Amino acid sequence: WLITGTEASCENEGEVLHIPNITDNPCISCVCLNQKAECKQEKCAPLAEDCALVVKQTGACCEKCKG
């Protein structure tokens, strides 16, 4: 069957296996863990809440603020 199921497998130990519903978010990436997508998500806390955002990249997950 051309379907691998909901589980993603890889050949390298500790590489990367990006998945939509998983890595769809920049903060979520997978790494070929034990032939499995070692996907983990990153979350950071704000500063001012409405801070001018002194930290932030064009394509970075995390983000700090304060202008």
Domains of the chain: 1-67 (6.20.200.20)
Measured CA to CA, the distance from residue 15 to residue 18 in angstroms comes to 10
Q: What is the DSSP letter of 57?
A: -
Q: Which residues pair with residue 28 across a beta bridge?
A: 41
Please name the residue that has the structure tokens 């790494």: 31
The answer to whether 19 and 37 have CB atoms below 8 angstroms apart is yes
In 10 A of CB 15, how many CB atoms? Answer: 12
